[PDB]
Amino acid sequence: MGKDYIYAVTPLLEDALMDRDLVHRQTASAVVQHMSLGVYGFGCEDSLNHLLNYVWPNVFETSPHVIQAVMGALEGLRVAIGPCRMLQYCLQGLFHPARKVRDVYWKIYNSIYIGSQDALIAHYPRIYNDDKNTYIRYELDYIL
Amino acid sequence: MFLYNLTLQRATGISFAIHGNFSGTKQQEIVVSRGKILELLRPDPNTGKVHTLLTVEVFGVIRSLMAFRLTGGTKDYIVVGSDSGRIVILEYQPSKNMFEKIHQETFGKSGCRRIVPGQFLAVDPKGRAVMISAIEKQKLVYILNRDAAARLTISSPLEAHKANTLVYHVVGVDVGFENPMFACLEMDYEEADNDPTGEAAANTQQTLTFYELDLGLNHVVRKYSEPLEEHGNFLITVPGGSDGPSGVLICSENYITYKNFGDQPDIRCPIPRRRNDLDDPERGMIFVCSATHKTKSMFFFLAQTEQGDIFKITLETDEDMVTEIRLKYFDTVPVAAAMCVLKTGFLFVASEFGNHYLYQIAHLGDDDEEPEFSSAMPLEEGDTFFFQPRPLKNLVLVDELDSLSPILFCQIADLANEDTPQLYVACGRGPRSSLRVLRHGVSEMAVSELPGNPNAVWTVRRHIEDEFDAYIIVSFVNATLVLSIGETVEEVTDSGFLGTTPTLSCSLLGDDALVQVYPDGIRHIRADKRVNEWKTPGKKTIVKCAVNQRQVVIALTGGELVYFEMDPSGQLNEYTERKEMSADVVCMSLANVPPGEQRSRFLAVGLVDNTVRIISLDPSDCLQPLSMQALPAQPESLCIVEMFLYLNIGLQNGVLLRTVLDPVTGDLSDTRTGSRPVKLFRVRMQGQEAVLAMSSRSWLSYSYQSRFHLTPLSYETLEFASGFASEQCPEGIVAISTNTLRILALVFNQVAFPLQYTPRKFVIHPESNNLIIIETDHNAYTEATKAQRKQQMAEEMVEAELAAEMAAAFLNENLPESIFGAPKAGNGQWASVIRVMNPIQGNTLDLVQLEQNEAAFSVAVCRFSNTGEDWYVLVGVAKDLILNPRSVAGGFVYTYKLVNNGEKLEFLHKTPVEEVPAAIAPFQRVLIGVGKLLRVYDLGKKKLLRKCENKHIANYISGIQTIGHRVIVSDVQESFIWVRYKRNENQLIIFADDTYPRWVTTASLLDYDTVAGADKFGNICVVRLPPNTNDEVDSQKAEVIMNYHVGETVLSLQKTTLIPGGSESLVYTTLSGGIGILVPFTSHEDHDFFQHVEMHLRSEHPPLCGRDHLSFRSYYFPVKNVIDGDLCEQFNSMEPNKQKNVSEELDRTPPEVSKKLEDIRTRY
Amino acid sequence: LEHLQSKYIGTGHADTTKWEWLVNQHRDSYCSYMGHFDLLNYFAIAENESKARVRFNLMEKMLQPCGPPA
Amino acid sequence: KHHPDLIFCRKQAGVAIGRLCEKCDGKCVICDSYVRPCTLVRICDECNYGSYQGRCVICGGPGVSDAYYCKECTIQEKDRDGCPKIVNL
Amino acid sequence: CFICRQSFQNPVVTKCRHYFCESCALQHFRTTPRCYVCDQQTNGVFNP
Ligand SMILES: [Zn+2]
Ligand SMILES: [Zn+2]
Ligand SMILES: [Zn+2]
């Protein structure tokens, strides 16, 4: 029943996520998680993606409570919006040069792949064949 | 937008099927999963036709289907392995005619994951345990035990997961009364991943691993592990115990090896090849479809060859080792993905393309004209017994269930003259291909009309002992016609009643003498030319005719009723007591009296003074009006029938009053239905009695379970309504119009005209108004290529004798595609044919042939851009095209003049290109997209005049839609990219891009900024561009307005009304044989009521597969403003307590919800 | 974390190779094409091949995804 | 309301039914909420068998009521993750 | 028939939630398309 009020609470959560204190970001991450799990399957993915545009910069936090809230918000956003946008967010950082940044991105991608192992095949990026092995599948190019 | 998508044409392509005693009785039950819905059929083998007993939609993707029976149980429970992680074992209830889930045990996550079990399912042969294994590195087996109430008590499964161990196939072996065991075709993958040189991948081979389920020890251990040289593409189990040895048989390319549990003879029998086959020998023959049939004493197997012929192999076990397997081709059948050999003369083979075949196996399997190859018969390891293609001798085909899967293209239009528009879908694979035109009428599959312009149509049967109407008298004022109920209704004079006078009615009231009410009176007429006629009451003719079993009441003007009772000699005797009603009775009917009474209990006649009088037809209460029914207006008809009995008087206006027909006067209730007078009479429909009121709409008050309800029907325009029964259907509704009779089944008839090759796209010419279809069966030999290969084989085997005669017979008369399959091979070769089918009939009025390596993909027949108004068609064909992997030469676009006003495919010239120009549409010039390069090239007769081409696309453009100054192209990565079609400015700039990656294979623009896409994972996504977007800009995305999953790979979509009138929705045809219309809901309150009903039904009725409806409808991407009509249809099919609970949750009535669903269905 | 979470299909780590991730993606794509009836019908009835022949070709292509490792 | 320790079993679930004590009654076994108890709790193995018959799938008191998953954990279907009985390691 | 203050025989309620006699409801549906209670869109339905 929250879909009438998602657009009302969107700028409040947007102002809360930009706060200096980690408590506001953690509790707003819990807000995004419960709001994403609440009205899943109702077409409110634009405001959820807009909130994810503020949540996903906060993945570099080191405190355990706020990073647990960030992981729960990422799980709720991957349930609600879909694994395609999470794969789009993680594809440019899974092969990051930094060890810690690519480790955190690999943790998020491993959680997304545990949750969405079946649906990630159709949302896999279109990469051509290289010198190591063939990559472009010809079964998807078949038309009947 | 709020779209309530509903599927009209269901997918019928059965991907898998099982059979057994799943019906709980001696009747054989076969359950076939036709996609998202599984249908269980128990057809009669004496009739031979296949009829589906029930069908249930589970809303999921089934990866493995199996059935199993317990120890001594007469019912075979079905264990379904779906995409959800809950394995469901269900028992079919024949009393409810549906499957009830006995148990549902959760195993893992939903979807078709790699480590998720459910890809392979098997059961123990002794009914001890059921094993579910994944595609890789996961397996489990739960022990199934009988409870105290003979219930399937499930158990916790034991873990059988090994690191990097893929499974090809698995089957539970027959261990008898001992501990059960299951064999699997394991393949190691750790050494192939570890070794980078690829030597371990070549060194790897399939191994038969038989693991014994130690039920006493409560553990699972691998008993035997035998490495096999041949890779196992299939696996079957021989019937152990009294039907033969306990072992397995692994099939490969012309090598079937049988091994038992221990030391057995590895009889590597070669496959019996065809006698001088036209197919290439490089393609190996393997048992794709295997069916082991065990008799009371012996057992046998049925296998599918490379040509598709069903071969029967006997089991010469001889109690020691696998010695012989007499592999003889039993019959020639079509291309079947799976075949099942049932008992009692039944053999079902599910065709992957075309009609599945349900044959009657009358013989014992030895009635085959083909040669026999035995496993004990030695050979030189180069050939077997040449099994020539024999006819259907051992098993005769008795049912051909037509299936549209696979589907290629479709187009629906009201070009033909019919009650409904014609949807012509060009589809098929190889030479097994056709264009099926489907049209509806209600179900008017057979059209029968009464002769002339009759006043009434009454069944005057020869006798009451005869079940069929021997003489359906269609009687007019001038003459009459006799038409039998055999779906051959024509004028004849075999009635014998001599109906030259104007007969009001003629019905078989007596045992052999039909009572006919006419201007002469009441005449008892037998089957011969004898009619004893008694006069009507008074000098006026009888207008109202209450007809019953023994007593018939003829009411003339003034309400004077004369009662004709059934005499002991069979004639009709007039009663000595008569009385007049209040006014002149218009029409009448009599209630169905019981067999103990010698007369009618209550015969009701409706006068013109807004009243109906019901009187007892017995001699003790003769001429005494008992029940008075108060009509609202002046009654034009009356009808007394069962549901005790009730009499309804219908008026000339829209008001009919029904009261209780009894010895006392009952309460009269008035109800409304077409500005026509009433002609209500008793009829039978859907197992219920009804009175059909004559109006503009098909209104029939049906009294089902003592509840008279009148609702409109979806028939054609008519002025009267009645019942009908003939050879086509047992009980239907006949809507009688001006010299027409609409038939309502209380479906759409499809006729398939065959084509040359497998179709690719259908194009209708503008000048011709005829479909210039292109058939391109790729990765197969062309007809000229097969003729050249047959000539080369005849030249090679001409030098020998009988080999030259065999080569000439194989070249002249090869294996046909209708019986034994057309022998075709190759990869770059393709059968191409351009055929012109007229709008009147689907026969080919023209034929254009291409090269043997070319496949025609682009089909567009319109006027030429470079030339004038001449309809020059540019058809694109890719030459030497191989699907897997990418290997093509180039695409040639041929321009054709389309002579004889488009009825002749006269090719003018052609022009080649390196890329594939499969997209060619008119754009101000014409937009032709070859590869990633789309050019606005004028349609020249010799060659196109390309002006500007841009190659900024990702991979290609599989489909381009345009409405003016803009072209939206569907790429491999992006679902829709819109480029501003500035043909005057000669500049190509991409106006709009997309962010959601989808391999869109369809296009249907609902608006200028709206683009539809059908992804490769079967997702329908309608995306609109953002408002206030600049046309001369770039780097702008389009938001997805709606996204849904249809459960099948959607092929095409067109934003046009698929029904006459109603709602102009969008119709999408899928590749699995499904067609669905996405009706946009323009009412917010109706959309909210549908959403509340869907939210109630998602919790009240769970799916059979165990997956959620929202999870199944949003598998690829999340759903957005999409409502599925399958749950709305299944809500009306629920139980009455569940419907009452859903109506209480929705704060309405269940009949009101059913009426709202019927209005949503009739909105179209 | 969990041991079975790292041992799950499609899992990885911070030092996961690109060829190993591509091979896992190709194996998951082959398993999804084998599991789905509509995807196998779309990739099978386009060519002139049987359904079980396409399943055997996909089973060979699953091992072929581990064909050239590095 | 959670702790970083106390991994549960990560075992394959069976036919045994979970059981909750009154001190932590009504809580979700995963996310510790109190909203919409939808799916029953399966406790896999010898967590039920033996001396731990009818005990708590949380702290360890004598269980009185059936444990449940909430609807929010079954939105992503975390109930198939395995046995939720706490093993103190 | 609540306007003429007469007797009612075979009572029935129309689509505008007005209960009256069957002959009176038939005459009201034939004479006018809408009900005379509150001008609702009953569409002249003479049903029980
Ligand atoms: Zn507790
Ligand atoms: Zn929870
Ligand atoms: Zn446990």
3-state secondary structure B807-860: HHHHHHCCCCCCCCCCCCCCCCCEEEEEEEECCCCCCEEEEEECCCCEEEEECC
Sign for the pseudo-dihedral over CA of B958, B962, B967, B973: negative
**Minimum Cα–Cα distance from A76: chain D residue:** D76
CA B671-B673-B679 angle, to 5 degrees, is 100
Cβ atoms of B971 and B955 closer than 8 Å: yes
Consult the annotation and say whether D38 binds a ligand.
no
- The two beta strands, B422-429 and B432-439, are antiparallel
Contact: A75, D75; criterion CB under 8 Å:
no
Cβ atoms of A32 and A56 closer than 8 Å: no
Q: Are residues B460 and B347 in the same domain?
A: no
Q: B744-781: buried (b, 16+ CB within 10 Å) or exposed (e) per residue?
A: bbbebbbebbbbbbbbbbbbbbebbebbbbbbbbbbbb
CA-based end-to-end distance of chain B:
16
Sign for the pseudo-dihedral over CA of C11, C16, C22, C24: negative
Contact: B1116, A122; criterion CB under 8 Å:
yes
C-alpha span between B695 and B719 (Å, rounded): 5
**Minimum Cα–Cα distance from D36: chain A residue:** A38
Neighbouring-strand partners of residue A64: none
C-alpha span between B898 and B886 (Å, rounded): 33
C-alpha span between B611 and B629 (Å, rounded): 6
Q: Are residues B256 and B332 in the same domain?
A: yes
Helix axes B1084-1100 and B1125-1132, enclosed angle (nearest 10): 70
B812: Cβ contacts below 8 Å, ≥ 6 apart: none
CB atoms within 10 A of CB B980: 20
Helix axes B783-796 and B802-812, enclosed angle (nearest 10): 180
DSSP 3-state of C27: helix
Query: What's the distance, CA B881 to chain centroid?
Result: 33
Per CB-CB distance under 8 Å, the chain C contacts of B779 are: 47-49
CA-based nearest residue to C32, from B115, A39, B603: B115
For B795, how many CA atoms within 13 A lie in the half-sphere containing its CB? 6
Q: Are residues B488 and B373 in the same domain?
A: no
Can you list the alpha helix ranges (DSSP code H) found in chain C? 3-6, 18-35, 37-44, 51-63
In eight-state DSSP terms, residue B925 is: -
Neighbouring-strand partners of residue B935: B928, B949
In eight-state DSSP terms, residue D67 is: -
Residue type, B16: F
Q: Are residues B388 and B461 in the same domain?
A: no
Ligand sitting nearest the alpha carbon of D61: 1
Query: What's the distance, CA B938 to chain centroid?
Result: 43
Enclosing domain of residue D74? 1-89
Per-residue tokens: B439: 């049209």
C-alpha span between B293 and B339 (Å, rounded): 11
Residue type, A9: V
Residue type, B389: P
Cβ atoms of B844 and B836 closer than 8 Å: yes
Can you list the alpha helix ranges (DSSP code H) found in chain E? 22-31
Cβ atoms of B438 and B422 closer than 8 Å: yes
Enclosing domain of residue B235? 3-402
Sign for the pseudo-dihedral over CA of B252, B258, B260, B263: negative
E4: Cβ contacts below 8 Å, ≥ 6 apart: none
CA-based nearest residue to B631, from B681, B571, B678: B678
Give the position of tokens 């059921």: B130
For B752, how many CA atoms within 13 A lie in the half-sphere containing its CB? 20
Per the rule left: phi > 0, alpha: psi between -120 and 50, beta: everything else, B218 is: left
DSSP 3-state of B549: coil
Q: Are residues B574 and B664 in the same domain?
A: yes
B854-858 sheet: strands from edge to edge:
B854-858, B873-879, B890-896, B907-913
Question: Does A40 reach chain B within 8 Å, measured CB to CB?
Answer: yes
Cβ atoms of B85 and B109 closer than 8 Å: yes
DSSP letter string, B342-391: ETTTEEEEEESSS-EEEEE--S-S----S-EE-SSS---SS----B----
E strand or H helix at B792, and its extent? helix B783-796
Which technique was the structure solved with, according to the deposited record? cryo-EM
Ligand sitting nearest the alpha carbon of D57: 1
Measured in degrees and rounded to the nearest 5, phi and psi for residue B454 equal -80, 150
C-alpha span between C20 and C16 (Å, rounded): 7
Give the position of tokens 């949540």: A55
DSSP 3-state of B761: strand
C-alpha span between B1118 and A125 (Å, rounded): 18
C-alpha span between B725 and B468 (Å, rounded): 9
Contact: B672, E45; criterion CB under 8 Å:
yes
Per CB-CB distance under 8 Å, the chain E contacts of B670 are: 10, 12, 22, 25-26, 46-48
DSSP letter string, B196-229: SSSHHHHH---EEEEEEEETTTTEEEEEEEEE-S
Q: Are residues B393 and B465 in the same domain?
A: no
C-alpha span between B903 and B845 (Å, rounded): 6
Chains contacting C with at least 3 CB pairs below 8 Å? A, B, D
Residue type, B175: V
Measured in degrees and rounded to the nearest 5, phi and psi for residue B938 equal -70, 145
Cβ atoms of B668 and E22 closer than 8 Å: yes
Q: B1108-1132: buried (b, 16+ CB within 10 Å) or exposed (e) per residue?
A: bbbbbbbbbbbbbbbbbbbbbebbe
Sign for the pseudo-dihedral over CA of B226, B227, B228, B231: positive
Helices (H) and strands (E) counted in chain B, each on its own, are: 9, 84
CA-based nearest residue to B260, from B330, B187, B320, B328: B320
C-alpha span between B588 and B1043 (Å, rounded): 57
C-alpha span between B246 and B673 (Å, rounded): 68
Contact: E22, B632; criterion CB under 8 Å:
yes
C-alpha span between B679 and B370 (Å, rounded): 64
Helix axes A64-80 and A99-115, enclosed angle (nearest 10): 40
Per-residue tokens: B29: 């039950």
Work out the widest C-alpha separation in chain B, in whole angstroms.
110
DSSP 3-state of A54: helix
Q: Are residues B379 and B477 in the same domain?
A: no
C-alpha span between B665 and B654 (Å, rounded): 23
CA A33-A35-A36 angle, to 5 degrees, is 65
CA-based nearest residue to B170, from B121, B207, B115: B121
Can you list the alpha helix ranges (DSSP code H) found in B1101-1124? 1109-1113
CB atoms within 10 A of CB B704: 14
Q: Is A49 exposed, middle or buried (0-12, 13-18, 19+ CB in 10 A)?
A: middle
For A83, how many CA atoms within 13 A lie in the half-sphere containing its CB? 22
CA B795-B799-B800 angle, to 5 degrees, is 140
Cβ atoms of B782 and B852 closer than 8 Å: yes
DSSP letter string, B616-674: --SSTTTT-EEEEEE-SS-EEEEEEEE--EEEEEEESSS-EEEEE-SSS----EEE---
Assign residue B597 the CATH number of its domain. 2.130.10.10
Neighbouring-strand partners of residue B435: B426, B753
B868: Cβ contacts below 8 Å, ≥ 6 apart: none
Cis omega (within 30 of 0) on the bond before B663? no
B910: Cβ contacts below 8 Å, ≥ 6 apart: B892, B893, B894, B895
Per CB-CB distance under 8 Å, the chain D contacts of B140 are: 12
Q: Are residues B574 and B650 in the same domain?
A: yes
Cβ atoms of B721 and B736 closer than 8 Å: yes
Can you list the alpha helix ranges (DSSP code H) found in B120-198? 190-194
Per CB-CB distance under 8 Å, the chain C contacts of A143 are: 46
Ligand sitting nearest the alpha carbon of D77: 2
C-alpha span between C14 and C20 (Å, rounded): 12
C-alpha span between B116 and E10 (Å, rounded): 66
Cis omega (within 30 of 0) on the bond before B431? no
Question: Does C46 reach chain B within 8 Å, measured CB to CB?
Answer: yes
C-alpha span between B841 and B771 (Å, rounded): 10
CA B361-B364-B369 angle, to 5 degrees, is 90
In chain D, how many domains are there?
A: 1
E strand or H helix at B732, and its extent? strand B732-737
C-alpha span between A108 and A91 (Å, rounded): 11
Tally of residues, chain A: 144
CA D11-D12-D13 angle, to 5 degrees, is 110
CA-based nearest residue to B510, from B446, B559, B461, B472: B461
Nearest to A142 among C1, C9, C46 (CB): C46
Question: Does A126 reach chain B within 8 Å, measured CB to CB?
Answer: yes
Per-residue tokens: B592: 């169905």
Measured in degrees and rounded to the nearest 5, phi and psi for residue E11 equal -75, 145
Per-residue tokens: B738: 């001006």
Question: Does A43 reach chain D within 8 Å, measured CB to CB?
Answer: no
CA-based nearest residue to B867, from B960, B957, B767: B767
CA B174-B179-B185 angle, to 5 degrees, is 55
C-alpha span between A17 and B232 (Å, rounded): 57
Contact: C38, B1018; criterion CB under 8 Å:
yes
Per-residue tokens: A14: 């947007």
DSSP 3-state of C66: helix
Report the gap between the CA of A130 and the closest CA in chain D (Å).
36
Resolution of the experimentally solved model in angstroms? 3.1
**Minimum Cα–Cα distance from A82: chain D residue:** D76
Q: Are residues B390 and B466 in the same domain?
A: no
